[PDB]
Every structure is written in C-alpha cells, then in structure tokens.
Amino acid sequence: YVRQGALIASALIMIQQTEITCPKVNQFRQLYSKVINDKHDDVMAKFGAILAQGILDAGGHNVTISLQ
C-alpha cells in the first residue's frame, strides 16, 4: 500500500509536465508502463500503479489537478 501510494504520488507530481522539468519524467512513465504491464505484482500495488497511470494521463495532457 505504501508502494502504490508512492506510485500515485509520483504520478500526481508528474501530471501535465514532460521530461524538460526533470529527465526522470520519462523514466517514471516507463516505470509506470512496465509495472502496469507486470501482472505478477500484488493486488494493491498493481491497483495503485494503474490509478497512478490514469491520473498521470488524465485527459491526455489536457486536464490537471492543482492546488495553486
């Protein structure tokens, strides 16, 4: 549950931003792709990974959730 929470948080920080902000952006996106394609992970970890992918690609780099 901490792993999936970290994945969701890393997706949330990475919404609406590309690799120009940090070179790790592409690394985390491919990390999300390989963990969502990895179906031998725990139920909770996979659930958070997919929610992380959804919030990251929310609307197709079109909408975002910001507190500012």
Binding site: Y1, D42, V43, M44, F47
Partner: protein, 287 residues
C-alpha cells in the same frame, strides 16, 4: 454472496476466555462457538464467547451439545445479555491459520445453520509473547470460483496487511472467499479501566533497594566492563589505517564500541542513580 472487507469487533473478555480455554485444554484441541451477531453484513461484533468441553469423539457437531447450548443461551438471556451464534472458535495447536478436514466439515454444517458462521483459527501454542493469531474466513460453494473468483469485493481495505499463511493458501479456507479483518473493542470506560487498574504499579515506585544484591551486582558490573576494557583495548590496536570499516566488517568482535554499546553502560548508570536518588529522597524524607 456479498463479503466485503468485513471486520470483527472482538471483545477483550472473549480473548481472555479463548486464552484460558486453550491454556486448559492445550492438547485436546478444545472447541467452542463465537457468540456474535450480524448487526449488518460486514461489521460483525462479538461481545462474549463461551468455553465448551470437546467430547471424547473429538471434533463433532454432537460434541457441542444442543440441549446444553440451549440451556446456556437461556441462562445468558436470564442473567447477562443475550447474543446470537454466528461464529465459532477453536484452539488449533497442530498447524496454523487453516482448518483440518473435520473442521471444514463442521464449519460447513455451521454455515448451513447460520448465514456465515465464520471459521476462526486461534493457535494457543504459537501465541507466546507478542503474536496471537485470530484468522477468520468463510467457506464457499463451487459457484464462487466459476464466477469472478477472489470473492474479495471492490475495496482497498482488506488488502491492508493481508498475509495469509502458506498452509492457509494451500487449503481452501482463507483462500475460498477472503480473510476477515480483526478489530478490538478498545472503548473507553473499558480500555481506560484496563490500563488504569490491571497493570497496577502505583506506590511501588518508592522502593529503595540500595545494596540488596547491588554490592555483588557492582562487582559483576566492574567485571563485565573490565571485559569491555579488554574489548575497547583490542579495538584501539586493531584501528588499522585501511579505512577501519574494512577491517571491522571482516573482524567483527561485538565489543564495547560496536555491539556492547553505551546503552548498556547507560543501563548500569541508570540503575546506580535510581538507587542513589531513591535512597537520598527517603533520607531527606527521614525527618
């Protein structure tokens, strides 16, 4: 056919009855039924539990005597508080969080009688110091597996700290439907009563004990720290000029600087000062 992330509000006295009953009949695999009520589908609450002697036959439905159970229920209704039967408990010294074949059969009979009749495994011998095991599951029919299996419903709660044992996994139970989450009725007027009264040390902090065993204890302390003297000696001539961590990893000695740390010396110092302060406090009280 709905079993969400269900939670059992088990009571402390139910725990005490469980441990007492198990401690009495450790090798007999004593049986009992968990007196609980389904206030709703998944927020099951158990306030009381009883102890029943396992008949000589062993794990049998007739061992739980029906007339005796009815008389016990009537006695609870007259004196105390009535409570339904929707569960059972069993000290299980043989192996862990799963059920034996006969336990599965009698739980199937209980499921036919009740609505769920949760299967609770409590190991009396494995619970020794910190870990008491109370795992509850449900038996399922063949239809649950042919439909969308893992009857665990759509929520992210029963996946929290859900680690079924290997023997539970290889058995149907704890694998048929789900593993039930446990909770303790730590309500106030009950929990504050327990912490205030049961674990009672209230005027026992005034003990003096200056030298009851402490003169020879100090002799032993000096001898132990003389061994620390040799150890911390040994360390200072080891002290090699090749990044001493490299020397230390391959030449661990568990010495005063490494493992017999300052914590132990602090324990000796605390013991001395505590006896000092107690003696001095009572000396100034002595007026």
């Amino acid at each position: 056919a709905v079993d969400t992330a269900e939670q059992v509000y088990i009571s402390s006295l139910a725990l005490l009855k469980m441990l007492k009953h198990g401690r009495a009949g450790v090798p007999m695999e004593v049986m009992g039924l968990m007196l609980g009520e389904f206030v709703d589908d998944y927020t099951v609450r158990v306030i009381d539990v009883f102890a029943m002697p396992q008949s000589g036959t062993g794990v049998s439905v007739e061992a739980v005597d029906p007339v005796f159970q009815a008389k016990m229920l009537d006695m609870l209704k007259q004196t105390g508080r009535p409570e339904m039967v929707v569960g059972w408990y069993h000290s299980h010294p043989g192996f862990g969080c799963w059920l034996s074949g006969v336990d599965i059969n009698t739980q199937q009979s209980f499921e036919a009688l009740s609505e769920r009749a949760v299967a609770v495994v409590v190991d009396p011998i494995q619970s020794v110091k910190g870990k008491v095991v109370i795992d509850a599951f449900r038996l399922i029919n063949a239809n649950m597996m042919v439909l969308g299996h893992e009857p665990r419903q759509t929520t992210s709660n029963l996946g929290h700290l859900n680690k079924p044992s290997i023997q539970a996994l290889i058995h149907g139970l704890n694998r048929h439907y789900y593993s039930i989450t446990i909770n303790y009725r730590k309500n106030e007027l009950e929990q504050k009563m327990l912490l205030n009264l049961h674990k009672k040390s209230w005027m026992e902090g005034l003990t003096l004990q200056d030298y009851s065993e402490h003169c020879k204890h100090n002799e032993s302390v000096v001898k132990e720290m003389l061994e620390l003297a040799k150890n911390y000696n040994k360390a200072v001539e080891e002290e090699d000029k090749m990044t001493p961590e490299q020397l230390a990893i391959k030449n661990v000695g568990k010495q005063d600087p490494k493992r017999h740390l300052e914590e132990h010396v602090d324990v000796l110092m605390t013991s001395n000062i505590v006896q000092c302060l107690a003696a001095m406090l009572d000396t100034v009280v002595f007026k």
